[PDB]
Amino acid sequence: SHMKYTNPRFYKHPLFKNFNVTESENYLRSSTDDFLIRKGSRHGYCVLVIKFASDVFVHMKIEEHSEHYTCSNKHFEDIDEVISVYVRPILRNLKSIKAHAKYFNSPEDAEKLLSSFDGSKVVYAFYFSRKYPGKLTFAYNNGSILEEYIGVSDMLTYNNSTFKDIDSFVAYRKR
């Protein structure tokens, strides 16, 4: 935006925390909280921080305009609407992902399974990307270990395609 004479309205919001990047991630590392909204380094916006895992954080710019907000190219009546329409279904998604039989917490620890490969079947694992916070890595071994990125929003997104959960993704990916 450009600067206004009044405090940004999101300052008054209960989810708004006066944190920078490190403080947000710190606070989230040791909180039960899954997300917060922090201050942006320049005027006009705050930033939604969602903890994907202990060391995976997603920071999304939320812009404040005269009545509405915008977040990820979508438009929202208020911050509460960002949370219900946008954040909760992400969390619902993250919950399923980490419940999955085939989800692991580290690449390093999804390592064991990928190495157990006989030649009998494709071995595959899932773990969140640290190189691209917000991506789920689909890793598989068919002879060589390959990797693919899946987007994590309210759905799982893979190239053109879109999935409610890992299961349906798996179904599509094989056949």
Q: Candidates 53-61, 94-102, 124-132, 153-161 — which segment interacts with its own copies by CB under 8 A? A: 153-161
Which residues 42-71 are close enough to bind its own copies by CB under 8 A? 65-68, 70
Q: Is 2 in the site for its own copies (CB under 8 A)?
A: no
Listed as own residue / partner, the contacts of 154-162 with beta carbons closer than 8 Å and 24 or more positions apart are 154/86, 154/89, 154/90, 154/92, 154/93, 155/93, 156/93, 156/97
Residue whose tokens read 């509460």: 80
- Residue 105, binding choice from Cl ion, its own copies, none, Cβ under 5 to 8 Å by partner class: none
Q: Is 74 in the site for Cl ion (CB under 5 A)?
A: no
Are 151 and 135 contacting, i.e. CB atoms less than 8 angstroms apart? yes
Type of residue found at 157: T
Q: Is 65 in the site for Cl ion (CB under 5 A)?
A: yes
- Residue 74, binding choice from Cl ion, its own copies, none, Cβ under 5 to 8 Å by partner class: its own copies
- DSSP state at residue 137: E
Q: Is 168 in the site for its own copies (CB under 8 A)?
A: yes
Q: Candidates 21-29, 53-61, 66-74, 80-88 — which segment interacts with Cl ion by CB under 5 A? A: 66-74
- Residue 112, binding choice from Cl ion, its own copies, none, Cβ under 5 to 8 Å by partner class: none
Q: Candidates 2-10, 14-22, 29-37, 65-73 — which segment interacts with Cl ion by CB under 5 A? A: 65-73
Q: Candidates 54-62, 104-112, 129-137, 163-171 — which segment interacts with its own copies by CB under 8 A? A: 163-171
Taking every pair of Cα atoms in the chain, the longest distance, rounded to a whole number of angstroms, is 67
Q: Is 3 in the site for its own copies (CB under 8 A)?
A: no
d(CA 35, CA 92): 13
d(CA 36, CA 60): 11
* Beta carbons within 8 Å of 85's beta carbon, 6+ residues apart: 74, 76
Q: Which residues bind its own copies (CB under 8 A)?
A: 65-68, 70, 73-75, 155, 160-164, 168, 172, 175
